[PDB]
Every structure is written in C-alpha cells, then in structure tokens.
Design an enzyme around this catalytic site. Structure first.
Site, PDB file in Angstrom:
ATOM      1  N   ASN A   9       0.870  -1.205   0.000  1.00  0.00           N
ATOM      2  CA  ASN A   9       0.000   0.000   0.000  1.00  0.00           C
ATOM      3  C   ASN A   9       0.897   1.242   0.000  1.00  0.00           C
ATOM      4  O   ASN A   9       1.214   1.680   1.117  1.00  0.00           O
ATOM      5  CB  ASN A   9      -0.892   0.011   1.249  1.00  0.00           C
ATOM      6  N   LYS A  11       0.220   4.299  -0.458  1.00  0.00           N
ATOM      7  CA  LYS A  11      -0.455   5.461   0.165  1.00  0.00           C
ATOM      8  C   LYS A  11      -0.167   6.658  -0.744  1.00  0.00           C
ATOM      9  O   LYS A  11       0.024   6.393  -1.947  1.00  0.00           O
ATOM     10  CB  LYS A  11      -0.101   5.740   1.609  1.00  0.00           C
ATOM     11  N   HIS A  94      -9.945   0.939   4.051  1.00  0.00           N
ATOM     12  CA  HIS A  94      -8.675   1.226   4.750  1.00  0.00           C
ATOM     13  C   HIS A  94      -8.995   2.175   5.893  1.00  0.00           C
ATOM     14  O   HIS A  94     -10.020   2.885   5.826  1.00  0.00           O
ATOM     15  CB  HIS A  94      -7.596   1.684   3.815  1.00  0.00           C
ATOM     16  N   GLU A  96      -7.373   4.770   7.059  1.00  0.00           N
ATOM     17  CA  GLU A  96      -7.152   6.172   6.701  1.00  0.00           C
ATOM     18  C   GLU A  96      -8.354   6.783   6.017  1.00  0.00           C
ATOM     19  O   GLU A  96      -8.642   7.991   6.244  1.00  0.00           O
ATOM     20  CB  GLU A  96      -5.894   6.326   5.847  1.00  0.00           C
ATOM     21  N   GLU A 164      -6.080  -5.106  10.256  1.00  0.00           N
ATOM     22  CA  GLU A 164      -5.052  -4.137  10.592  1.00  0.00           C
ATOM     23  C   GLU A 164      -5.458  -3.329  11.810  1.00  0.00           C
ATOM     24  O   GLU A 164      -6.194  -2.344  11.674  1.00  0.00           O
ATOM     25  CB  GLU A 164      -4.864  -3.117   9.436  1.00  0.00           C
ATOM     26  N   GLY A 170       1.507   2.324  10.925  1.00  0.00           N
ATOM     27  CA  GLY A 170       2.565   3.306  10.790  1.00  0.00           C
ATOM     28  C   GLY A 170       3.223   3.794  12.058  1.00  0.00           C
ATOM     29  O   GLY A 170       4.034   4.741  11.982  1.00  0.00           O
ATOM     30  N   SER A 210       2.443  -2.157  10.810  1.00  0.00           N
ATOM     31  CA  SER A 210       3.883  -2.207  11.128  1.00  0.00           C
ATOM     32  C   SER A 210       4.547  -3.524  10.750  1.00  0.00           C
ATOM     33  O   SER A 210       5.509  -3.921  11.434  1.00  0.00           O
ATOM     34  CB  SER A 210       4.041  -1.786  12.571  1.00  0.00           C
TER      35      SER A 210
END
Lengths: 247, 247
Positions: A9, A11, A94, A96, A164, A170, A210
């Site tokens: 991904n 991003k 996702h 985000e 996730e 992150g 991570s």
C-alpha cells in the site's frame, strides 16, 4: 492451500522515478513462484505501474474507488477505469479512509459489492482502535465491520481480508504473531458460520500494521496469517524480504 | 484583457479510447489562438491525457487533490504527482466534493493554499444552491466561500474562479447570461477590494452549470464572464463549439 499474499500500500507516496525503481526491484528479485503480490500506487500511477510490471506474481490495485462506474462524481476513481488501465485490485475500507474521510461501514459495503460485480478483486480492511482494543471490543468491532459487508456480498471468492489494528498502522507497534494468529482464527471462525467452511478455508486474512522485513518472519508459522498488507515497508527494498519470509 | 478559459470536467468518465478521441478532436479542430483550455480527466488518466495533447493551448488538470503532498492518506491525489505526470491544474471545491464528500470551506481553503504553494493552478469552484438563490443569499454565500480562501491565500495569479450555481450543475437549468453577468461583476468587485484592482482585473471568473454548445454563445458579450467550466459537454464534440463561442 491458501496462497501467500503480500499487498504493497504505497499510500500518497511516489513519482515515476521512485515507482520505476520499486517495480524494477520487483521484476528482478528472486521470489517463490507460489506468491501473490499486489502493489497499490496512487491512482495517478496505475497505468504506468501496470506498464513496468514484467512479473507474473505482481499485479496492481488502486487505493480506493467509488461505488459507481461513471457519473457526476468529481474527484473519485472508478473500478471500470482502474480495470481499463490493467489493475486487478482495489483496497476498500482502509483505516485512513475510515477516520479521515468518514467512510462508513455501509459505504464500504456498497463499494465492495460493486467492485466485485465489476470483476476487480478487493482488499477489504478492518480493525480496531486502541480504545476498542483496551475495552475488549476487538472482535465485536471486526464482526461489526464484516457483517456490514456480508449483508451485501454473498460470494467472497475475490475478497482478501486485511485485519489491521488501527493502533499498529505506521506506529511501529505491531500486534504480536500470537495475538494476530488468534484474532485471525476467530475472524475465520466467524466467517465460516456465515459463508461455509470451504469459503472461509480459502479466504486469505492478511495481517497489517507495522509489518516489516524483520518481524515478517515471526508470523511464518501462523496458520491463519495468510500474508501481509504493508504500508511503509512497501516503498523499501525490505518489501522483497517480506515476500520471501516463508521461503 | 483576460484570456478566454474553457475547462473540461470529465467527472467520473472516460476510457483511454474515449479520452483518446476527445483529445485527438481538440488536436484536430480549429480553435482560437489565445484560448486557454484545461481538460480534467479522472486521475487514472492524467498522464496519458498529457501524453496525447499536442496543442499548446491545451492543459491537463486534475479533479481533486488532498491538502498535503505526501503521506499516509490512502486513496487521495497529490498535487506533486499530478504535476510529476505533467498536469498543470487542480479543480478544488467542486460542489460534488462539497456535497457528497463533506468538503467544507476551510478544507477547501487549505487545499487551495497548498496547491498553489506547490505551483499548480487552481480552478476554485464556488456556488449557491436553489434555496440560497431563492432566498437571495447568493452573494452572501459566494463571498463566504471566497473569504475562507482569501484568508489563507493572497496571490491569486494562478487561481481561476468557477462560479457554478449548484442548481445548474448537470440539471440543464443554466443561469441567464444576465444573472451570470450580474453575479460575476459583484464577485469581481468584492475581490478587487481584497486583492486590489490589477489582481481582480486579470483574474478569470468562469461560469459553469449546464454551459453547452447551444448557450455558450449567449454569454459572448458578458464582460465579466471570462469563460466556462464544462461538465457534460466536455465529453462531447460541442465542447470545441464552446471554445469557439467568442466569435
């Protein structure tokens, strides 16, 4: 059995120069032939990215799509279009998107049903916040998120689920192989009740949050960990290490 | 003088083939010298678009960008990438983003400031709804929207303002050239006070909201209407008719 699956991904990162570099590293690298690798660049680079790929195990996906193919929706991406250009996947749900862009469960359910109808595979993202975790709500939370999709999608042949933990995205605070395996097992068990065992047996449930070239190897024996969805590491050489982690 | 500017908002529409045909048509047809044309395809087709254009009057722009250049913003567009691929504009604040995607005045202001800072032109959309219009708030509304930007932004060299009554977007209910002419001059007035005379006088203010091959001409002698932002019609041949609308 379930083929190992690694998603990259990117991003909102990349240039033709950097993308070039990643894709070429992949074309060149030694990876088992029994792996499924998907790289997800900014929409601006789907086409280009599709053009650099010279490896059978590597396929391109988008980072998000709307729930209609065409229409008056300025600034969105279409499944029909990502497919026209050669992509085969789209990440939906996702974290985000979920927090920042207020993408609700129903919305993601509508998008999943849709893309799947158009013949693109889906990387469906689910997971809890530190606060749902702490409150022992990890499983309700994921079952909430999946249930919203299940009400819509009956055929999950082309779905890949990526659990996730929000708190691991992150941050570098990955879940332990142990916690991930149990969570994955529970998810899988949940789904079998809903889609039958054949279907839940064949479903890939990736871990994300991570995952790096170092800890990947520690998830190598977790039966219900079928691969990864990699954020930050996808843009590093170390991504190849992730791919070979079971090799 | 102000150079006639025509913007083509593809919205979620196109294929390489349909975009090829559109662009090849722009390439082929007799269009004025000193026209400023910007075609805005889905992000998926930016790069390709740009490689097809042969005409020096024609620029490529994107439909949306986020307010940061890089990062963990899965699914977004970067001004840096659209630029990398050679687009020169971004459309920000389109009513579709404002409505479906909950984009507020600030976000849009922030987005406008970043974009410019990275050196891409902005096509800033502003407009009132039917309600606001019926209630005689139109200036109110647009002065609102514009100020949010004015507050972060100061140098509008590279900004083009697209006044688009929400009630005219895709409905076939276009404003009259009178109304439009009226509204643009007020808005121009307003900006002169904030941006000074020269600025307000060189700033293009477009009209959008069912501008088509039939009525584009009816706006020809409206001094403060500097061009259009076209939706439906940009996909059509009559698009080149809008560009040649100023006899």
């Amino acid at each position: 059995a379930r083929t190992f699956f690694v998603g990259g991904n990117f991003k909102l990162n990349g240039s033709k120069q950097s993308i070039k570099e990643i894709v070429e590293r992949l074309n060149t690298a030694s990876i088992p032939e029994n792996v499924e690798v998907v790289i997800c660049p900014p929409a601006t680079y789907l086409d280009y990215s599709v053009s650099l790929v010279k490896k059978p195990q590597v396929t391109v996906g988008a980072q998000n799509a709307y729930l209609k193919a065409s229409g008056a929706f300025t600034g969105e991406n279409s499944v029909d279009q990502i497919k026209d250009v050669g992509a085969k996947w789209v990440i939906l749900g996702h974290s985000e998107r979920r927090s920042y862009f207020h993408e609700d469960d129903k919305f993601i359910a509508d998008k999943t049903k849709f893309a799947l109808g158009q013949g693109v595979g889906v990387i469906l993202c689910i997971g809890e916040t530190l606060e749902e975790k702490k409150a022992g709500k990890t499983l309700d939370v994921v079952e909430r998120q999946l249930n919203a999709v299940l009400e819509e999608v009956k055929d999950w042949t082309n779905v890949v689920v990526a659990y996730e933990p929000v708190w691991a995205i992150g941050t570098g605070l990955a879940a332990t192989p142990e916690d991930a395996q149990d969570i994955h097992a529970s998810i899988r068990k949940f789904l079998a009740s809903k889609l039958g065992d054949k279907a839940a047996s064949e479903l890939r449930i990736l871990y994300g949050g991570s995952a790096n070239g170092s800890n990947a190897v520690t998830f190598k024996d977790k039966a219900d960990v079928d691969g990864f969805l990699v954020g930050g590491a996808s843009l590093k050489p170390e991504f190849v290490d992730i791919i070979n982690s079971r090799n």
